[PDB]
């Protein structure tokens, strides 16, 4: 609210914004938020299980809030002498206890990589911490509820779960993904993006398990379901920071020349209960033989004592970055390819934005079992290339040995074409079932396919070699279908598949 | 799937009106530097970029009663001083919003040309101006 | 809401008549001075205004019996002396009043051109004059 | 010394520019500092636990009285500890708002957003050309952003607000030079 | 760490430094060191089996 | 694989500005001593190096309001005394960093030349200076 | 941010008029003294300032009816006596005020040159003068 016409000046720190226009790659994201409201001034959460469409990160923030503050950051400062000179080191370790809520960070990566409008489904709001070593948990039943809700929406094409890797067990994780694949099979218009449970060996509570075999045994559905999704490995390191407050951070201070107790006494000595405190404290001077002046204080309480320490520590805290599963980055990448090259091209050999590096290095030889395997349950790799950065390498589905459906771009092209055609055919639903209708429907479908051919989506020198459409009594329908009100239309398409291998050969030129 | 047309546009130049009949000269150009040493197996030269140039911009409009703006801007020249302006040229969509924008730095007028008069001149009197500038940036998002 | 036409006008030049067939050359022009020092991050030059120029004015009219004025004015030249005149050119409204006026200082004639003759020349004999001057001011209120 | 320093600030802005530190400046009409400050004595003036730095006036042999140091009262501030950074920003901010006032009562739509953006970028390009900003090309020196879905929402359009975001790359000075000596040998 | 602006003087003995720009001849060296860390103030050796790229002898040290 | 261009450079001479229009005279020269004794089978001379010389350096810049530095340096001459300076000339890359540096010892000015004035002189007023020095070292690493 | 032009100026020389076509010769020059003793490790010389010189100043103007001033000043020479004058030359701004001033002490004329005559000489008759002087000071504040 401003009252005087004119120009106002503010000073802030942030990353610049990014938006995009996307028609064919709209994801839904199911998970936890800070709050969920329809108006800025309400007495409750209005949107907990209500899908909402968001155009940009600002719209998200407006109704759902930001990230949860981390409560696992500690600081250790040590004072020593070098040939009689003072020298100190400030060390801020990576936290071992982190907030389990990743939707905010996930969306930042999505928009950074070119994503457009999307659907948000809340499952609840962020819970609190029990202690500095005891974080909130993720409730499996809340994610199932959100999935049941999105099932009633028509617009979404991709399904993602930003907080699935934080579920208490791997069994719950795999169960959630099996349900998502089954939903895609029943609706015939969706595709899922999958992560491993962890990018490192995980502890089952009874055994040490390797993440790739884990996922392969975890997802046990057949061909009909596997054709509707794909998986990526490893996790990636981003350039995003952590959200925190100096009020929650405590400093340990060690010194070659201790003075924590003496400091407390000088201040305490500066009524009956005050005397008891001082005596109790002075008794400890013989005990403390390691701690310096700042030991035990919070960052926000030492700035006036030494703002060089305060500022140095904040700078060190800022050097720690966020690590994420790659699924939201891939949803972003899918949108970029559809806009620049088309849905019929493979979503691979794509650079990712805001990625420093893969968390795990994958060698050439190590990928052979990821691309080709006896089970067909292929995994695509994220790899670092010299002079190029982090690229998506490979584009197969979870049915990698399927002669018709092994490539992602074939499955996605068909889903697109099928959706567009049925929208076009709905205008004829209550028309008479006769020759006049059969001709109108056929002509409409062929015109659509001619345009797809003209744009280079279909194979063939002329439309006659790219597709066919058939309808008629004695061809696709019988007398019984006419009596029951059925209409049968048959369509066939010629679709182009990519090359994967290039072999070079060298020799010594001779006559 | 279709290209843009060339007749719906606007020009912001610090004047009262933004409608023009014709706009031309939105060009960018770079010089070439050539080289060959005597021992090379090829008998042609290698090329690299040199210094940069810009073209002058021409604007054309019809003459209207009580609008003397071309003259008034030109008449701000005083020995080496002149009023310099930021010139923004934009190609518009069906909602009359910008699609393609040409941004021009530090413009001022080299010349102002008036209309000819004819006894049988059954047409509109058109005046024109030629502008110098120091740089062009093209935006199309 | 409509622009001015270009066929109703008059010229005051010190002669007996004010009607002309054609008027052209009412232009203004300025020179550019360019500069670049070697340490600049930009690889192009900065521009500023130089000295000023004016174009010559051409007037065309039909030849009439007993009117020898183009010649008589031209014939006032005597070594470096000539009769100089104030030239006023005006674009008129429907009441035959001025709308746009071009004011020209210190004019005199550089050249007078006569008509060609043809056996099958079924047309009007047109004479013309070219004038030098020292300055132009444009008024449109 | 405060009036002498106001004078000195004006000299630097005219000969070198507002983005350069107001230090290593000789003062006019000064015989000497009233109190001598040694090298060691200044260590606690430039760097201190509270950040409340004090600049020193010192006498140098063959040079006269010089201004030594150019920090603000927030000396441990990673963004604002130098005087020349704070002053450069105040200058740029004032010049830009004067330029934006011409658009105050204009329609809040795409045509305006483009005109405002272009105007601001032209200003910043000239500051870059003159050497005030860091970066090989303008693309590395600054950015300007405005638009619905980027800086504004539907609610801002309804209330008549317009949001423009600007970022700048600014150069900071070196303070210490260390020389090392040895006996040259094969 | 220095606190006062100015020129400091030190006296040392050493061979002068040398660097080069090389694109086609990058070696790897495998062996033992005094320590292996990513930061000057750590409680352990961080880089024992982690490859690192070095531009000059100062970076190595 | 490409040679350096000659238009992006800077000069450090103790003045307020480092931008110049033109720099020339960065030369090195050695004398020859010749010899032949009468009994030699060859009828030509043997050659060896003599004493060394340096050329004067010329700097050219445009005249600006309130900058009187060429004059002020020249005016430090007092019988045999003058302010001597270290002159550093550098050819720059795309990051505006040095590539080739010319280091000049003990420079001072022999002469300062002002601009000519012309009634039709539509151009920039350029001043120039000529410098004496005692030695040149060339660095290109 | 822009350099000065070279066409707007005035000259005060004690005459009735201050307008000139051309002004040149505003130079300053110093001699060099060189030295080397035989034991020096360097095989080149050390340099220091010598005595000073000034150039003559040339002024050019068009010939006008009844103005004989170049001649009248020249004709004040009588054996070793001459009228000496203070010469002030100034480069002007847009308000016609001084920007750069050249101050010249004790000037008098060495020579006066008249115009050539030609039958087909379609141009202005220009006279010129060359002046001796004893010193030049340059002011630019």
Numbering used by the authors:
A (entry chain 4F): 3 to 272, 450 to 690
B (entry chain 4a), C (entry chain 4b), F (entry chain 3a), G (entry chain 3b): 2 to 142
D (entry chain 3A): 505 to 690
E (entry chain 3F): 3 to 63
Paste lines from the article.
Six protofilaments of sheath proteins adopt a right-handed helical array with a length of 92.4 nm and an outer diameter of 24.6 nm. Unlike the multiple sheath proteins present in PVC/AFP, the AlgoCIS sheath is composed of only one protein, Alg2, which folds into four domains. The conserved domains I and II contribute to the sheath wall, with additional domains III and IV extending outwards. The sheath subunits are interwoven with each other via a conserved ‘handshake’ and iteratively assemble into the full sheath, where the attachment helix in domain I mediates the interactions with the inner tube. Interestingly, depending on its location in the different sheath layers, Alg2 exhibits pronounced structural variations. The hinge angles of domain IV were also observed to be different when comparing the different Alg2 layers. A lowpass-filtered map indicates that there are two potential conformations of domain IV in the central sheath layers. The inner tube subunits possess the conserved β-barrel structures and the N terminus of Alg1 is shorter than that of Pvc1 and Afp1.
CISs are macromolecular injection devices with an overall structure that is homologous to the contractile tails of bacteriophages. Their conserved modules include an inner tube, a contractile sheath and a baseplate complex. For firing of the extended apparatus, the baseplate undergoes a conformational change and triggers sheath contraction, which in turn causes the inner tube to be expelled and injected into a target. Here we performed structural and mechanistic studies on a clade Ib CIS gene cluster in the marine bacterium Algoriphagus machipongonensis PR1.
